[PDB]
Design an enzyme around this catalytic site. Structure first.
Site, PDB file in Angstrom:
ATOM      1  N   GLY B  11      23.869  54.531 100.343  1.00 46.01           N
ATOM      2  CA  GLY B  11      24.227  55.592  99.417  1.00 46.01           C
ATOM      3  C   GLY B  11      25.300  56.532  99.952  1.00 46.01           C
ATOM      4  N   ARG B  72      26.550  47.426  97.817  1.00 40.47           N
ATOM      5  CA  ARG B  72      25.518  46.522  98.323  1.00 40.47           C
ATOM      6  C   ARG B  72      26.113  45.188  98.758  1.00 40.47           C
ATOM      7  NH1 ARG B  72      21.931  46.493  93.895  1.00 40.47           N
ATOM      8  NH2 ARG B  72      20.271  48.080  93.929  1.00 40.47           N
ATOM      9  N   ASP B 103      20.133  53.047 107.419  1.00 39.50           N
ATOM     10  CA  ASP B 103      19.374  51.972 108.060  1.00 39.50           C
ATOM     11  C   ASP B 103      20.069  50.623 107.986  1.00 39.50           C
ATOM     12  OD1 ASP B 103      16.387  53.524 107.693  1.00 39.50           O
ATOM     13  OD2 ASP B 103      17.832  53.772 106.046  1.00 39.50           O
ATOM     14  N   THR B 125      23.574  59.546 106.006  1.00 37.90           N
ATOM     15  CA  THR B 125      22.580  59.466 104.944  1.00 37.90           C
ATOM     16  C   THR B 125      21.917  60.831 104.823  1.00 37.90           C
ATOM     17  OG1 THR B 125      20.563  58.336 104.142  1.00 37.90           O
ATOM     18  CG2 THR B 125      20.780  58.640 106.514  1.00 37.90           C
ATOM     19  N   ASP B 127      18.594  61.346 104.063  1.00 37.15           N
ATOM     20  CA  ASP B 127      17.142  61.407 104.215  1.00 37.15           C
ATOM     21  C   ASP B 127      16.641  61.411 105.655  1.00 37.15           C
ATOM     22  OD1 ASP B 127      17.155  58.471 104.453  1.00 37.15           O
ATOM     23  OD2 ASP B 127      17.439  58.545 102.265  1.00 37.15           O
ATOM     24  N   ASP B 129      16.411  59.524 108.091  1.00 36.44           N
ATOM     25  CA  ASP B 129      15.472  58.463 108.444  1.00 36.44           C
ATOM     26  C   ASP B 129      16.163  57.402 109.294  1.00 36.44           C
ATOM     27  OD1 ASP B 129      17.085  56.992 106.757  1.00 36.44           O
ATOM     28  OD2 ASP B 129      15.433  56.090 105.624  1.00 36.44           O
ATOM     29  N   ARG B 171      11.221  58.620  99.575  1.00 35.70           N
ATOM     30  CA  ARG B 171      10.897  57.192  99.520  1.00 35.70           C
ATOM     31  C   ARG B 171       9.967  56.834 100.667  1.00 35.70           C
TER      32      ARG B 171
END
Lengths: 318, 319, 319, 319
Positions: B11, B72, B103, B125, B127, B129, B171
């Site tokens: 994203g 993608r 990721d 990103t 988030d 993560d 998520r």
């Protein structure tokens, strides 16, 4: 008048505090006392009333919401309730009332005057759905809140997440959706004052997808339907991943823009003038960039509309 | 190296452009050319590659999104896609690749280096993560985007409308919900990591209604469930009218904050240093307020965790 | 203890209210009362003290400034003043004081501690110039206020009129200037912690113009000199039209960012823990992204520094 | 017409891009080609001109500044330059010109008009000083930029520093100062179009502190004088410490507000219509909330005025 009161009703709109500030300062300027009525008509019946001093509005012009609060009061929509209100006004020596709020709050403003209490309504709402005014206090702020979200969405387009639906407020009035959509460069705008074909909408997504449009942004007024539903149907129909934003009550909050503060200040002051001029049962507004005031009954009897040319313009530009 | 490439994947994240700018400017400072790869790994495979001049990054530091775009690419998860990717890099005389993303972008970076092509991951990103970094580029901006929403909701105080659910991104990672909830003064925060008792949420609600609390704000990470669902549950169970905001992809957009532009500038530059100094198969990060880098595989093998004390603290500050 | 107090001193800093709210909530969580002290040490002496109820900080987390106000107080630099303060505290049953503010506020906390009164300091200022912490509460917000201005200036470039000088705050520290300059893509940054050479500067500006650099932005920490003066000094040197912005105290105002609200919440609560643990005479901070606390005297003994690599990085990226 | 052109001239103004977007999209809808003229009239003479594809304006509606750039051109104030310009236009098959900018840009429109070349003027400037319109594109955005600063200054309060001077732009017009002053709750507003008694100003300022006014804010339009000089006069007459903020060119920058984007869209579109309708030598605007257009030379003869009741209103409210 030696003493007047002010209240807010119908839920928060950015610029209500600017309008309260103006009422208070304008009246004090003319030697009039101002009393705050808290919690709208509910607080009026309850006698939740307190003098507002010059300093009590000295740090609020830039604050969202309303320092007076608002509360729904069906009890006031009755004879016995209006009587309690009148009684509370007389006990506090309040001779006239400035009511800042939506079209709903106007009805109560009218009744009070009929019982010999001059009341003037000020249009405080983001909906922009009040007759007798081109713009309501808070509408401009809401628009900027909406395009803030639209702008951010423009940064996020990828090849697989290219279609976005944003649901804005507007249960019966498409003003927020139309203006936001135009200012936000939205591809499609759904409003209650205009009919739309879901096939034309889907067709438009594809045309854009073909010529390489980076993103398709759909603005949907809540009065037309759920953002979630439109997005799901669109994905189902197209295979295009569709992302949904529901702004909700965010649109009612935040610090008022310059236009809202200025409008709030002028209408608020105008309201005080009308009371001191001995007028009553009136509402203030701006029309053709000019301050006006109408009989409440006469104004409420008109039907609110949107600018069709602007709706049509928005289609041409996308 | 005389020529490196840079790409964005996953994203959009605020600060990606600042990272791209840093990669380009740091490389040029050392006399190295940078080639832009457009549309992530999909673009790499397709050969959507084009040199970035010094002026191509002169007005982007403050821009959200990514001028290189993202897309993608499942094929790049296979031997075939990796080979095609390498063919394109080699064809354009690109000797190393900086990958800015989440990721899955790191997986591509690992595979690339297992194939002998120098690649460095930069954490882009919202988030937060990503292993080997306390903070990802975009996280801080996302947080501020969320509290902007929370702050506005605090202006809307109707006596019968004082209960608000806001659905944020997550998520798997509760970082956004946790940090924005703490920063936003939320009453309740639902994150995917921790268990929650709906019974506790409601009691805390009522407890606040009794004491006259003017705003009850509940933050829910998408990974936990739908804001609309929770809003309905809460209204059904308390009779308190409940309003819901779903922010969605707004959280990925907008001009990066100062912190994100600084992080992006520092990390992008470091990725270049790693490529020019022979390293590869690494990802960069900031940990304990210090610039670091790690073997990709080693970093990817650690599970992300939210700060448990901060969660506990958020519960102490609400009550 | 069963009752503590809290006040704000020094300039206003975004996040002060978040810190206050955290002090009150954390204390209350452990069954402890909190009394607000208004107008700083002055108000402490003058006995301006009132209990803070949970509802009194229920709506401030997002507010700039400080609901407790701030003010200068030379009297508190004297032993008579200091004594009159403890007098007032013990009169109100306050067994410990949290002080949120800049350098000056720490001297008073040291003194009260020398006089055997338990006091903890919380770093609240925008200039990032307080020992025992990587970041002070307010710093992040100020950076974002500065880059908002730098971002708008980028929209106004015009090949002939394309050289801009922004003067930022930071009395003796160049943190604001350095971080905001890196974040804003500034070509040149002037701070007290690093020697500069206007010749080396002028050449930069020209080399930039030579290759058609869109805009040239120069950031000047106020502790290095005046921006109006560096502006004039630059025009008649290059013939280049130069515009100057002096932001001033806007840098102290505004709603705190997410990072400032989070920092303020964590540091505020930690300050309460210290008092309740009987560990007065300390100051709290975040160092290497971990919460820390230090003896005040020892901390103040440390001199302030910036990250030289970062200054060097900003030079490298602005080519 | 088969093909028209558009350029921007004068200072940068937020919404110029929304205006450019509308000219291009509106023309395309009608099957007309649009060619960008870069660097205003300077670029027109020099032939700095290139077709704008529908995708060249696809991501600019929300961007500040102008993608066509702006530049000064003394040459176009002469018969020779005007002819070279028309020659360059014919040279590219450009049949009509949309000019977006200030009153300077209108002169060029009028001139190309006396020469029989179809040109329509669109008002793009922040100072609101353009005839034939109640509001110019960029004015609203500038107002909000100013009040952002005023709002932050309110978080900066003390007994010591309670008096603030803010110098805002406007050139010869007080609109920015009057509207921003009223919107910002300024105690005193100094504008070109209304006389002021400095002693009344001083007296009003003292009146305020006597009653414990939170903050005293004074707005100064640049066309009236210097913020720094007024701030000195005031500190010297009252002894009150007076901080000056000079916003400068930041007011021209930033993303356009909703109103500016809507205005830009409507006026841009109208400008194209006027060219296709075989009109020319007109300028468009909004008056009494209605789209209007006027003969350029005629409009240019009207003197600028402000709303004096609004001015009086501001005096009444700041007591």
């Amino acid at each position: 008048m030696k003493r007047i009161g002010v209240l807010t009703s119908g839920g928060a709109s950015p610029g209500m505090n600017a309008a309260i500030r103006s009422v208070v300062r304008k009246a004090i300027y003319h030697g009039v006392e101002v009393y705050g009525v808290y919690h709208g008509y509910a607080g009026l019946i309850a006698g939740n009333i307190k003098k507002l001093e010059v300093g009590d509005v000295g740090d609020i012009i830039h604050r969202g919401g309303t320092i007076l609060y608002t509360a729904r009061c069906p009890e006031f929509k009755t004879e016995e309730g209006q009587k309690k209100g009148i009684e509370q006004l007389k006990k506090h020596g309040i001779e006239g009332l400035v009511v800042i709020g939506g079209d709903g709050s106007y009805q109560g403003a009218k009744k009070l005057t009929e019982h010999g209490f001059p009341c003037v309504g000020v249009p405080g709402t983001i909906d922009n759905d009040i007759p007798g005014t081109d713009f309501t206090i808070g509408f401009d702020t809401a628009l900027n809140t909406v395009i803030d979200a639209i702008d951010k969405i423009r940064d996020t387009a990828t090849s697989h997440e290219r279609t976005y639906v944003i649901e804005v407020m507007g249960r019966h009035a498409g003003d927020i959706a139309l203006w936001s959509g135009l200012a936000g460069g939205a591809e499609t705008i759904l409003i209650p004052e205009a009919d739309y074909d879901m096939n034309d909408v889907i067709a438009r997504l594809k045309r854009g997808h073909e010529r390489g449009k980076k993103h398709s942004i759909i603005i949907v007024a809540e009065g037309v339907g759920s953002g979630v539903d439109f997005g799901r149907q669109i994905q189902e129909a197209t295979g295009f991943e569709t992302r949904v934003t529901v702004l909700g009550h965010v649109q009612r909050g935040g610090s008022p823009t310059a236009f809202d503060r200025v409008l709030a200040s002028r209408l608020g002051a105008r309201a005080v003038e009308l009371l001191l001029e001995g007028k009553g049962g009136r509402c203030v507004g701006i029309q053709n960039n000019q301050l006006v005031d109408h009989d409440i009954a006469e104004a409420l009897a008109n039907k609110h509309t949107i600018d069709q040319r602007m709706y049509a313009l928005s289609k041409e530009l996308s």
